[PDB]
Amino acid sequence: MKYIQTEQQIEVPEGVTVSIKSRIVKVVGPRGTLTKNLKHIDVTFTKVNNQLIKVAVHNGGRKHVAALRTVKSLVDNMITGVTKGYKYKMRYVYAHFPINVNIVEKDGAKFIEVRNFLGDKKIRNVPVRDGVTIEFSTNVKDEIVLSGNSVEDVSQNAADLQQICRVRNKDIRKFLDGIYVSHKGFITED
């Protein structure tokens, strides 16, 4: 319909420096730093008062101003990931064969190996994305916690660890076996 001017509202908390050049966003907070390259969107960022940044689309169609809230959510995810962090908790689900998941070291690359998935002799290796740290929960049975600054890195590494444990040639409604995301949340949240 070619909307005149659409606005979204990125709120910047304390301790967080959101420095935006052309369309390269750099968010520095207590937990670290994150950099996004939003050069594929055609939006305009304006800082209001050091706690608020507007992002705007001028003369945008429906598919263009659909990407404005995506951009606002992406920079909000950067801000949330460098303030509170991100923490995805996965559970191992098996029927008979226990899934033995360890973290292994292969010429300095930090894989997660999965052995005995449905009695396979195949060792399923999932590399750990940089920024993502892996721990295995004590006092919660069969839980792996992937945490980091980037929701994209953390959630894609969790998705990789899930997708490596897919069941082939079987009814997957009965063979419900794998590693699944049971929780998405933050590191220091209350």
Place this chain on the structure above:
RNA sequence: GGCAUUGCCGCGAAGCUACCAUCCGCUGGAUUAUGGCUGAACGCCUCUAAGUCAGAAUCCAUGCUAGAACGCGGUGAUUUC
């Protein structure tokens, strides 16, 4: 020794040859289908719209064959008593 249009029989080196004999037949990337991540549109949801992950005997390379006789390069020597 000759001739029998290589006279015939047995063995027969060399050469040629046989899945009738042996040897050899490479591994990276990009993808489709599909399953996903982040995520709006549509305050929710959503693999999709922006962005992105994995992935077929596919595709393109690595490898292999020919080398443009009007594609190119490096280098040697370049004529007399």
